Design a protein around this ligand. Structure first.
Ligand SMILES: [Zn+2]
Length: 257
């Protein structure tokens, strides 16, 4: 099926998922000098105090840290968002080298990786219904650069050896996602899509201006994961990112000057 290789990567997705060439595809390049400051944007409200993590899974494309979203335990509100969006999972996209890995770019600059905290609009009842709406999801994107280690990420790094291959999962309770955020919540926002098939155009993207720093040792462990399943020929899980897509008829707004 779809992947990130030469024969099943981003260049091939449109054949099975024609929306890949759609009206509001993601990611995109954020031209900082074209984005418009919007003084009407309310402050971003990240409420992860009651977040309940449950499990970490290698799905063959990346690894997902899943949360209990049966209640408003961990939510994202404010900013360009109307209503309440519940955290369901987070995952990353990274490269084979420190010079690439992020999906969104800033003035064409590629970061080592990108963290995506996925939330769905509670007005729609469940995640499956939400992805069918233009304002169904809100994904908080955070860039990762290589420098000093991120203490709040180590717990994630330590468990990767237990989910090396596709289909593997491990219990991952009591993890605090607040430890993955930068100091500032300044952000850019625009209407987009899921960056992986089915590429549904149901996402309000909120990309933070300030990247978080992770150590070389931490990202190296991400690169030891496998796209393949147990017993199969090893395919290192690297460069699982979709390149920037045409902005087309869209405007990127900034929460800061
Ligand atoms: Zn993602």
């Amino acid at each position: 099926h779809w992947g990130y290789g030469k024969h099943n990567g981003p260049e091939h997705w449109h054949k099975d998922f024609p929306i890949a060439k759609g009206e509001r595809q993601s990611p995109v390049d954020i031209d900082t000098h074209t984005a418009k400051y919007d003084p009407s944007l309310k402050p971003l409200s990240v409420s992860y105090d009651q977040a309940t993590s449950l499990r970490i899974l290698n799905n063959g494309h990346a690894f997902n840290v899943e949360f209990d979203d049966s209640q408003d335990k961990a939510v994202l509100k404010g900013g360009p968002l109307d209503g309440t969006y519940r955290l369901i999972q987070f995952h990353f996209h990274w490269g084979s080298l420190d010079g690439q890995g992020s999906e969104h770019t800033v003035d064409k600059k590629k970061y080592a990786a990108e963290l995506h905290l996925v939330h769905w609009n509670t007005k729609y009842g469940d995640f499956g219904k939400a992805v069918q709406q233009p304002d169904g999801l809100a994904v908080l994107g955070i860039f990762l650069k290589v420098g000093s280690a991120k203490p709040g990420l180590q717990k994630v790094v330590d468990v990767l050896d237990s989910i090396k291959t596709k289909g593997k999962s491990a219990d991952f309770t009591n993890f605090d996602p607040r430890g993955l955020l930068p100091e500032s919540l300044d952000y850019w926002t625009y209407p987009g899509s899921l960056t992986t098939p089915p590429l549904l155009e149901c996402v309000t993207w909120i990309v933070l201006k300030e990247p978080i720093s992770v150590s070389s040792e931490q990202v190296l462990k991400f690169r030891k994961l496998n796209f393949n399943g147990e017993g199969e020929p090893e395919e290192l899980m690297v460069d699982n990112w979709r390149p920037a897509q045409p902005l087309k008829n869209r405007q990127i707004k900034a929460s800061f000057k």
